[PDB]
Ligand binder design. Structure first.
Ligand code: HEM
Ligand code: HEM
Ligand SMILES: [Mg+2]
Ligand SMILES: [Mg+2]
Ligand SMILES: [Mg+2]
Lengths: 106, 106
């Protein structure tokens, strides 16, 4: 899957976690967002096509995703304990990384 | 070095930044710090030895460092812009991150 597909998989699943009632739904959604994130990371965004492999940017965007996966595990750890609400909440913090990094790379 | 040294390097250098009066000292300290972090991140803390690298824990431990590294980077950039005060101020935010993950794994 490509970046356009990765982001799409992310957006959709964060939606699902909103409409989610039971724990499981929330888990399968994150499992998916964690896969997508890592993949997205292995990619090179159109605004960085020229940027060098180790450009400070390439390191920034890189780290960004590590923060996203980090926050996904946070909510994943919770969905696992069966704690919906808490995960759903912890899942919102993700919009903050989205905005912070989109602002810089979208 | 071992997790005992890396942290030594962090506690040592962090304080250096507080007593420093010019950007230069700050940047050098932060640079050393950034290293130590990436290093501590690669080791397994005693309290987590018998754990699995896929364990919820290792993920949270993994993340903490990512948070810290990002913070060292945000203060490092300010120092490269000569904001000795804004830089030190940012550095302060590191403690918050330490007290938090030390509670869980120290
Ligand atoms: C889970 C939170 C996130 C959501 C819901 C999300 C959602 C989206 C959506 C809907 C798009 C538009 C895709 C299109 O129009 O084809 C997009 C694009 C993009 N996102 Fe995210 N995103 C998230 C997190 C991130 C993060 C953390 C990064 C960077 C570390 C990132 C980097 C990008 C980039 C570079 C694009 C533009 C792709 C292109 O130019 O085709 N996104 N994202
Ligand atoms: C840059 C802010 C930090 C400072 C100044 C700091 C400082 C220290 C100091 C002085 C020690 C005691 C070492 C010893 O007694 O030998 C220590 C231990 C430790 N720190 Fe940090 N630390 C920081 C951040 C972190 C973070 C983010 C983590 C999260 C993984 C962490 C995890 C640990 C652990 C697990 C130990 C115990 C080592 C042991 O006794 O085996 N520290 N830290
Ligand atoms: Mg996908
Ligand atoms: Mg004092
Ligand atoms: Mg940053």
């Amino acid at each position: 899957a490509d970046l356009e597909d990765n982001m799409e998989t992310l957006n959709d699943n964060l939606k699902v976690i909103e409409k989610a009632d039971n724990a499981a739904q929330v888990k399968d959604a994150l499992t998916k967002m964690r896969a997508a994130a890592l993949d997205a990371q292995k990619a090179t965004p159109p605004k960085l096509e020229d940027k060098s492999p180790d450009s400070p940017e390439m390191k920034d965007i890189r780290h960004g995703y590590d923060i996203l996966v980090g926050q996904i595990d946070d909510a994943l750890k919770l969905a696992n304990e069966g704690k919906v609400k808490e995960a759903q909440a912890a899942a919102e913090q993700l919009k903050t990384t989205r905005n912070a990094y989109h602002q810089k790379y979208l």
